[PDB]
Amino acid sequence: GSHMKVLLLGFEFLPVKVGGLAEALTAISEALASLGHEVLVFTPSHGRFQGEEIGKIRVFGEEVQVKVSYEERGNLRIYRIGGGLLDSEDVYGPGWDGLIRKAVTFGRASVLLLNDLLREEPLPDVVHFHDWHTVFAGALIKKYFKIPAVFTIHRLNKSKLPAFYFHEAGLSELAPYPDIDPEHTGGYIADIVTTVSRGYLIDEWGFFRNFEGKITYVFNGIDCSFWNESYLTGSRDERKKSLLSKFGMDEGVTFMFIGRFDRGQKGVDVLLKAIEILSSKKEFQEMRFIIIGKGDPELEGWARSLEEKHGNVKVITEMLSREFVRELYGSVDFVIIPSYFEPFGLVALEAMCLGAIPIASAVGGLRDIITNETGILVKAGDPGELANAILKALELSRSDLSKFRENCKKRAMSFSWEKSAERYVKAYTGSIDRAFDFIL
């Protein structure tokens, strides 16, 4: 018994991308399957697959024909579950009430499907469920089949649900109040609880402190086989010289930002202001900025405005191929990640993994990923301090950054999905270190 059987519940799984959660859960599953563990995944189909009907369940006083599409690759067994709301293409729910009802459904469908497999299989050793959306599935499997349960949180959505929903789920015991945080419920029924970086755990301790003793962290990974320089050709300078002229710009210290333009999240506002600050220092002429992503009309406007009044600065709102992004991480010098908060920090790992030096906000997982030897941390929400950090970065490019880049690659490779899988395995048995209130 080193081998075990993991039931994994995720509300999005590849090929059904929305954020990175899809890619993240697919990777954990696969890394897990590679260690020789037998991994079963339950996820909704979202009307991307049509399955065989296997049974009808009653939900919200009405019967629903539960369908399933099965796929098997090595030790991994993937079970896409369709049905009533589970057929809806709007992944995060046909509206608020729609999402919750689809989650409640997914719970009862999850029971039904597990129950059928038990006709001819043993119980899995653990149920590993991800984010609040799968709480109904987890809580029900935990309450009936009484197996070990782990609750991984990839991000705190931080709200409450009417108790109505927990009653319909057959979980009235869990909803003794009129409104219930489904993230508190998840952690309350799980035997141990994880989030996705040590620093996010510190940052959100005011909440995670509720599970003091059963609470720990397990890092995400990066697949540095894809984000790998072998795919490119030329030296760094040649690729960079070439890419800079593809944007009608000559040679300079090149910084890049990739992410959504939004309000208090990814921090493009902080970068735009920080560029205004720099735009009148002497050394600004020596620098180049490539700002990639879209969203907020006002920030786009601000971005294009700075673009118009500096040939120095180029902006890109059309989305681009992984392959071209890989090219970018491989030519630019620095990658700026001015996040306001950040559970993990995948962008830093993808950049680091191709040689780009991170200049990052000192928030959540970025605090763990980035070190003195690999990048530059900065107080978040502070454009003067990000401005100083870009200037310091300029006075480094004087000398060879070759060392910083190699440090970054090495470091990024230590954040493997294998290791991530390895620690979850420890978590499944409870043979893991955890955070306590009386341990400083």
UniProtKB/TrEMBL annotation:
<comment type="similarity">
    <text>Belongs to the glycosyltransferase 1 family. Bacterial/plant glycogen synthase subfamily.</text>
</comment>
<feature type="domain" description="Starch synthase catalytic">
    <location>
        <begin position="5"/>
        <end position="201"/>
    </location>
</feature>
<keyword id="KW-0328">Glycosyltransferase</keyword>
<dbReference type="Pfam" id="PF08323">
    <property type="entry name" value="Glyco_transf_5"/>
</dbReference>
<feature type="disulfide bond">
    <location>
        <begin position="224"/>
        <end position="353"/>
    </location>
</feature>
<dbReference type="GO" id="GO:0004373">
    <property type="term" value="F:alpha-1,4-glucan glucosyltransferase (UDP-glucose donor) activity"/>
</dbReference>
<protein>
    <submittedName>
        <fullName>Glycogen synthase</fullName>
    </submittedName>
</protein>
<keyword id="KW-0808">Transferase</keyword>
<dbReference type="Pfam" id="PF13692">
    <property type="entry name" value="Glyco_trans_1_4"/>
</dbReference>
<dbReference type="InterPro" id="IPR013534">
    <property type="entry name" value="Starch_synth_cat_dom"/>
</dbReference>
<dbReference type="InterPro" id="IPR011835">
    <property type="entry name" value="GS/SS"/>
</dbReference>
